[PDB]
């Protein structure tokens, strides 16, 4: 338990410890996430290979770069266990799936402290602007019922879920938000879904969601008041997929520099738990 409770006495030695990209080329791993359509359009059995030789140019040793195929934003959102030190995920603007995308971004780009929830035995409540309920799986359908200080429904009967309030109808990833400081009897479809209680926090010093297409205005907050725009949230103009990858390669370091993988590692992807 070495850490703080001490002070780092500054002093402007002003000594410059040149480069920094030379340590990351040697010691780190880069994982590229793309959708199936991306690879299908490329139509080569050796595209992963060609790009890899091209990656030596930018300075990444052969065994360094990995290529993971999500086939949809919904599945990728469930199974996002981030494999490498640096993860740069390519997302193609699908306009009907925007919130699916927002919920997925909110998970990768950030940090998330979560504990398991037993919908069956207990009446739960979120505490602050950072306590959210992140549920994900085959088909996530969440109905809620707010409790007054008596364990009684408010606009519902804690007995018949036909009076509950539906806040998610069969999603693959869902970050639910309820009025802070109020207990709720929850009714998830635990058969196909898993709902966990997460506390947010540390942005991610890895993922660099690169967005293909649209015109983008990403509002990734649950509130209405704030709009955060981070460096790990980049955008590229769609032409052809081969072009996208060429650019990602031609600017790997620039993209990596906007992350920095020291806070990474973790020990697996997403969640957390500290159950």
């Amino acid at each position: 338990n070495y850490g703080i409770n001490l002070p780092i006495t500054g002093s402007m030695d002003t000594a410059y410890a040149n480069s920094t990209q030379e340590e990351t080329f040697l010691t780190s791993t880069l994982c590229l996430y793309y959708p199936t359509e991306a690879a299908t359009e490329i139509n080569d059995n050796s595209w992963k290979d060609t790009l890899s030789q091209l990656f030596l140019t930018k300075g990444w040793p052969t065994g360094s770069v990995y290529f993971k195929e999500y086939t949809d934003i919904a599945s990728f959102s469930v199974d996002p266990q981030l494999y490498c030190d640096y993860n740069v995920v390519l997302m193609k603007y699908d306009a009907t799936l925007q919130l699916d995308m927002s919920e997925l971004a909110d998970l990768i780009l950030n940090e998330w402290l979560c504990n398991p929830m037993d919908i069956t035995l207990y009446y739960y409540q979120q505490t602050d602007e950072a306590n959210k309920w992140i549920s994900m799986g085959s088909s996530c359908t969440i109905k809620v019922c707010p409790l007054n200080t008596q364990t009684l429904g408010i606009g519902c009967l804690t007995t018949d879920t036909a009076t509950f309030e539906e806040v998610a109808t069969a999603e693959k990833l869902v970050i639910t938000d309820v009025v802070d400081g109020v207990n709720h009897k929850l009714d998830v479809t635990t058969a196909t879904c898993t709902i966990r209680n997460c506390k947010k926090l540390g942005p991610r010093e890895n993922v660099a969601v690169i967005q293909v297409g649209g015109s983008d205005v990403l509002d990734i907050t649950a509130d209405p008041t704030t709009a955060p725009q981070t460096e790990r949230m980049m955008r590229i103009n769609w032409k052809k997929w081969w072009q996208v990858f060429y650019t990602v390669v031609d600017y790997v370091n620039q993209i990596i520099q906007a992350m920095s993988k020291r806070s990474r590692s973790l020990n697996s992807a997403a969640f957390y738990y500290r159950i």
């Binding site: 035995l121 207990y122 409540q125 364990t151 804690t158 400081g181 109020v182 207990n183």
Partner: protein
């Protein structure tokens, strides 16, 4: 499903505080002190309210 729960009264109770503070910023001085030389015991405190 009734058995359980995990939180109550705080919300109204955590709430309440934020007002107590602000409401303090006005208390006089002299008038206060004195009312600390008067054995404000049991019967006293739960008189008004």
């Amino acid at each position: 499903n009734s058995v359980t729960v995990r939180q109550d009264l705080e919300r109204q109770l955590g709430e309440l505080r934020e007002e107590f503070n602000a409401l303090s910023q006005e208390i006089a001085m002299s008038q206060l002190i004195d009312l600390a030389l008067l054995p404000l015991d049991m019967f006293s405190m739960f008189s008004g309210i």
